[PDB]
Every structure is written in structure tokens, then in C-alpha cells.
Amino acid sequence: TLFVALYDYEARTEDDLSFHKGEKFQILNSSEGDWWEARSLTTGETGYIPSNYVAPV
Template sequence: HNPRANKIVVALYNYTARESTDVSFVKGDQMEVLDDSEPDWWRVLHLRTLQEGLIPWNFVAVERSVESE
């Protein structure tokens, strides 16, 4: 279990939510990772829409980690 990673990720591609638990985003959007303990889906907070939900991890890249600053 990973206690609040505080990673910021940036979208590499557009993604349209397929489930009510998913978060839609467009390329370039930034999201804060709330939980990355699942291998395929990360729980995030979308920093523009403030929507919280799941995203496919392979659609984003880690922009920065707050811990490493």
C-alpha cells in the first residue's frame, strides 16, 4: 500500500471515460496521483476539472514527484 504518493502526471493522449468511475482527460492535462497501488488503473484527482477517479496508467507520464523536490 502506498500512502499518498503526491505524484503529478501529465496526459500523453486523450482518454474518454468508459465507466462512471473513470476520469476523462485530454493530452497535456495534469492530475495528482492519489493511489497507484493497482497495476493498471491509478486513482487520480484531475487538477483542472477536480474530478476524482480512475485512469489507465499507460496514458500518462509522471511529470514530477513532490517527494523528490
């Protein structure tokens, strides 16, 4: 139950999470909108990512 990035995304607020196509994640909170609070498997950094930009492994 841990998603992967489909497209690259550069965040522009301190609370979003930036990532490169292929960076793996792990959702900490999807139940709140189409902006999921996720945790980067690569860095360990948490923050909101646009759910429409990711998909399950």
C-alpha cells in the first residue's frame, strides 16, 4: 500500500513535498482530500502531494 510518482513536481509552499518521477512514497493520510500527506521512501520527508500525480506500486 505504498505509491510511486508518475510525474515530477516542484512544491512552492513549505508543507508540500517535491519529488522526481519514480520517487516512492507511503501515504500517511489520504482521508482528507485529493492532497495526500505522504512520506518519501527516499528522504524520509513528509508533506502534501497531489494524489492525481501518484499511483500504487
